[PDB]
């Protein structure tokens, strides 16, 4: 454990609470991609099956349970409670172009050919591209609300901090995971345009696009 991964985790929990409180207080999920939230719920579901086989720490167990609960609660608000404000007409990314190939690649390229390891790998590849339906909806609709841009900033910063965490762990404890690293680079690379626009427009009081 280092400050880079702790800040990465805190930034990820911040993104999840920003979005959940935005929908809850405003009673509306307008502008939010439901498809991305189904993919992030699927990530925590396939990654944290080890909760039944391993205990790392109270913090690790608590963070897993919190991520699962908040992810399922966000999907519930979009598709059931506030479904009247869900913009289905603009959240049109065909998610089967992500799930089917990512499923194929997790079976072929993994550390071990076993159900739990394959499912863990699928969560790592799926998370790389999970935000694609939300960025696609913003490009289609045009703009993005300020609170939605803050959510995207803390979510994007989280895996960027994990890359710093992996440099630290490689240097100090000789630990290295090429699957998490490569996928984490792909994950961060997809935020490049958003980050440039967030810094040049949003942080200067201007609207996105």
């Amino acid at each position: 454990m280092n400050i880079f991964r702790l800040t990465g985790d805190l930034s990820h929990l911040a993104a999840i609470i920003i979005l959940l409180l935005k929908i809850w207080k405003s009673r509306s999920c307008a502008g939010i991609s439901g498809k991305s939230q189904l993919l992030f719920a699927l990530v925590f579901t396939t990654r944290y099956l080890d909760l039944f086989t391993s205990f790392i720490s109270l913090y690790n167990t608590s963070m897993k349970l919190i991520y699962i609960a908040c992810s399922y609660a966000t999907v519930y608000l979009i598709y059931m409670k506030f479904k009247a404000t869900y913009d289905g007409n603009h959240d049109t990314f065909r998610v089967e172009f992500l799930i089917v190939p990512v499923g194929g690649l997790s079976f072929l390229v993994n550390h071990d050919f076993s159900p739990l390891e394959i499912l863990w790998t699928f969560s790592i590849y799926l998370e790389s591209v999970a935000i694609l339906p939300q960025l696609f909806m913003i490009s289609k609709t045009g703009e993005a609300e300020t609170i939605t841009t803050h959510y995207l900033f803390f979510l994007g910063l989280y895996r960027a901090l994990y890359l710093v965490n992996w440099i630290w762990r490689y240097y100090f404890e000789g630990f290295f995971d090429l699957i998490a690293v490569v996928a984490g680079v792909v994950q961060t690379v997809l935020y490049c345009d958003f980050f440039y626009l967030y810094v040049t427009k949003v942080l200067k009081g201007k609207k996105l696009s």
């Binding site: 391993s54 790392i56 690790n60 963070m63 991520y67």
Partner: peptide, 6 residues
């Protein structure tokens, strides 16, 4: 094959 991160 211990996975120690979230």
């Amino acid at each position: 094959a211990e996975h120690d991160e979230l």
